[PDB]
Amino acid sequence: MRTYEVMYIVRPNIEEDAKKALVERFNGILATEGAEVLEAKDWGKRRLAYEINDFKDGFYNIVRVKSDNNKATDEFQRLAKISDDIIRYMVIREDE
């Protein structure tokens, strides 16, 4: 039993609303495993401190989950690389 957070950078090029459906479905595929999801929040538009491919802008999303090693970090660490509209992620422990 543990706690785990996650950040990830949804991109500006992609459609904001389709990506919104995508990220709420992420909230699903994360929380539905018994994951103590706390809040997911959108940073909004901002200049990336450094882009990766072409993304001058981008949106950020952070989640807090109080759960063991096998509910959200395991499943979405793979469901993040399949996630193509998004550039990156950062799952971490739920302590901030």
Next chain:
Amino acid sequence: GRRRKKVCYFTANGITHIDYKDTELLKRFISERGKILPRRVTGTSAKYQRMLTTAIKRSRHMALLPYVKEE
């Protein structure tokens, strides 16, 4: 000694922070070159120094911070 830097700037923070919620405190944490103002010239204890450094290095990996910043 020893050779750390100034503390008590946490008068409105502490003990653990942030990690990222104020880019402006991180502007003062370390240098702006991508290189790191050392714990020698940052100051907070190696526990908090290490956690703040891994926060900023993640922001680099998080694209919240540039890994290296140009000029």
Next chain:
Amino acid sequence: PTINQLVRKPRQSKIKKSDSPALNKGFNSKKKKFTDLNSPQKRGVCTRVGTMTPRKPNSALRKYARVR
């Protein structure tokens, strides 16, 4: 060392070997049995005689011989 390991050990000395291989007659002339005889003397022949030369400055010419 600790008392126990001292017990389960002999604390062996560094006993030497006689740099003079003086194995005198012992059982040489029966059974050719090697025998550590410490005799101060055995009778025997120098089958060949020779003379190696010393280096300078003391050119004190020393003579050798191989013996049985």
Next chain:
Amino acid sequence: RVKKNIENGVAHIRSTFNNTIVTITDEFGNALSWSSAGALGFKGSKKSTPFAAQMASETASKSAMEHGLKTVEVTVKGPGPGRESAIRALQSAGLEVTAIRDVTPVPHNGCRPPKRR
């Protein structure tokens, strides 16, 4: 395409220990023209003499302004003793360089390069 005419390019400056290959480029960019210190007579122990860098810079800069150009940046890479003097004589040589950029981009513990020397 040959020498892409802009009035603010980048003068790429390399000055090795046995060559000073220095060229004019663009910010697009692309190579336009250069010269090598070994190519310019200074050869052997001389392939990177300070005046070798100086005159190679002369060649490159001159070609740069006949490309049609006033201002230009400098990509100053090859580490050489005479390349800075070359830069100065280029600034005085009708060039309006204002971004003095001696570039030595180190990788992030990038793969072990040829190291032996």
Next chain:
Amino acid sequence: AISQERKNEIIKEYRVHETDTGSPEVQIAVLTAEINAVNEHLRTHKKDHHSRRGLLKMVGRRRHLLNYLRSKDIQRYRELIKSLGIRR
């Protein structure tokens, strides 16, 4: 993992006095559960060295606690090793 939840759960029973902190019966129960968990981790973490060293020391210390429960007591030990099924 475990935390004090299952710890207290499995100490609810073998406490000679429910406030005790020696009498390793409950404690060795905790150790049993924890070594089971770390062995699940080890099956997950096929190669390392921390699980190996940790299991070494933990199971050894629990073994010695049992030996005590076999020297301090004579029936509690067996009744554990039949109930707990460890260090029989």
Next chain:
RNA sequence: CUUGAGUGCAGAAGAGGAAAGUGGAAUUCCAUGUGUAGCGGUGAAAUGCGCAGAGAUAUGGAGGAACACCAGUGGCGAAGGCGACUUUCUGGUCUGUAACUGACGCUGAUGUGCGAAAGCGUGGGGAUCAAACAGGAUUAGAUACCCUGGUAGUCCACGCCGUAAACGAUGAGUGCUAAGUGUUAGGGGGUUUCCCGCCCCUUAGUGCUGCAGCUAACGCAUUAAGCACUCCGCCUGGGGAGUA
């Protein structure tokens, strides 16, 4: 009986481990576009590359590589070693704690795991790097080195590897003992707005100077190399020869 040990509660604590994923600059290679004439290494260069574009450039990737700072007597570790980020599911860290069975402890022959690099078996990769290598300076000879490229392997899977400067050639634990005087996490008291700010007490380590002590000297000196204690191994001149 308890503090040791236990474990108990509260916290504090992290390059610890191994698995997995994510990024990055970029060795090298190479796409495209531009662009010379040379690159090239030197004593000259040879070579080797290369005028059909080398060396160079800018746009583009590839692969594999280890991850720019931090980085420090930070830390983890028992060491090897352990630093890009993250997670895996665990191992360890301590403050306080005294929770209370009641010595449960002790180092540890055998045994025995873990473990730089190379090397290597196999099966891949090979991005470098790289012996050997050769072109080739040099010189009958030229690998000698200065070249150019490339090179087993390095690199991925497991074994073999188990070895080294793995060195502090300071086994471990115990507890005692001037100081000054820091650290790395703690805590407390008062001090004050968080005393965080101060101080001081110790917790547990890691400093520098130095009481005593001791060392041939060197220096340590609360973290002793001072004092003692259970438990391990070595050492026996040099070297012969770690070699048979």
